[PDB]
Write a protein that binds this ligand. Structure first.
Ligand SMILES: CCNC(=O)c1nnn(-c2cc(C(C)C)c(O)cc2O)c1-c1ccc(CNCC2CCCCC2)cc1
Length: 211
């Protein structure tokens, strides 16, 4: 193996129903959240590079790419952000899933708008509105490349990854549900990016396919 399995420390089930009962009607939100996460990690590497420019030896270009693949039924979002160590990976998709759900449910009960979801650290899980499964590949300067994977059931895996090296950053592959292929269409992606992510301060490039 060298594959490790972790049980969700929270009810990810409770998070998932909250996300359904909050965004099922506007699923395109997932793109906003993932792009927003990318921008966050890009801000971090930018910031660290100011004090230590050798942080950029793993890649100088700071960007976000979107890659639909109809044949595979995947939407992939790549960024050249700071990436996650193994511990960052578990902290951000596991640990925070518990405390961030708790925090976000409290704020919603007190009247906060749903659009705050990203601020409670659980925006990533909106991906499960469109994806049956999600793989996260990540690389941080201070660690090896890892692959995280979950169908948002009771568990997720982490493994040392041995695919193509990214130099630094994070790639999220959405294995879309059969009924949500619309997020593979160029026009659709474009509209969502225009609508939600126009103020993102890094270039966001859609890779259109040939047909
Ligand atoms: C420890 C240093 N590493 C990073 O922080 C990092 N590196 N890559 N990413 C990253 C993560 C995701 C999701 C899988 C969680 C992503 O879609 C894209 C990313 O670049 C991240 C990342 C980790 C967490 C988040 C979530 N931020 C919530 C935060 C809460 C307080 C308000 C401001 C925003 C967003 C991006």
């Amino acid at each position: 193996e060298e594959v490790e399995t972790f049980a969700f420390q929270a009810e990810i089930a409770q998070l998932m129903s909250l996300i359904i009962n909050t965004f099922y009607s506007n699923k395109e939100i997932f793109l906003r959240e993932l792009i927003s996460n990318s921008s966050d990690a890009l801000d971090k590497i930018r910031y660290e590079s100011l004090t230590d420019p050798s942080k950029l030896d793993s890649g100088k270009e700071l960007h976000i790419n979107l890659i639909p693949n109809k044949q595979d039924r995947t939407l992939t979002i790549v960024d050249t952000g700071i990436g996650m160590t193994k511990a960052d990976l578990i902290n951000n998709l596991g640990t925070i899933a518990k405390s961030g759900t708790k925090a976000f449910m409290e704020a919603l009960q007190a009247g906060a708008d749903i659009s705050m979801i990203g601020q409670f650290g659980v925006g990533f899980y909106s991906a499960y509105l469109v994806a049956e499964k999600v793989t996260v590949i990540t690389k941080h300067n201070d660690d090896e490349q890892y692959a995280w994977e979950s169908s948002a059931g009771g568990s997720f895996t982490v493994r040392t990854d041995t695919g193509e090296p990214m130099g630094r950053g994070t790639k999220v592959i959405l294995h879309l549900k059969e009924d949500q292929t619309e997020y593979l269409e160029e026009r659709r992606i474009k509209e969502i990016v225009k609508k939600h992510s126009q103020f993102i301060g890094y270039p966001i490039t859609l890779f259109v396919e040939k047909e």
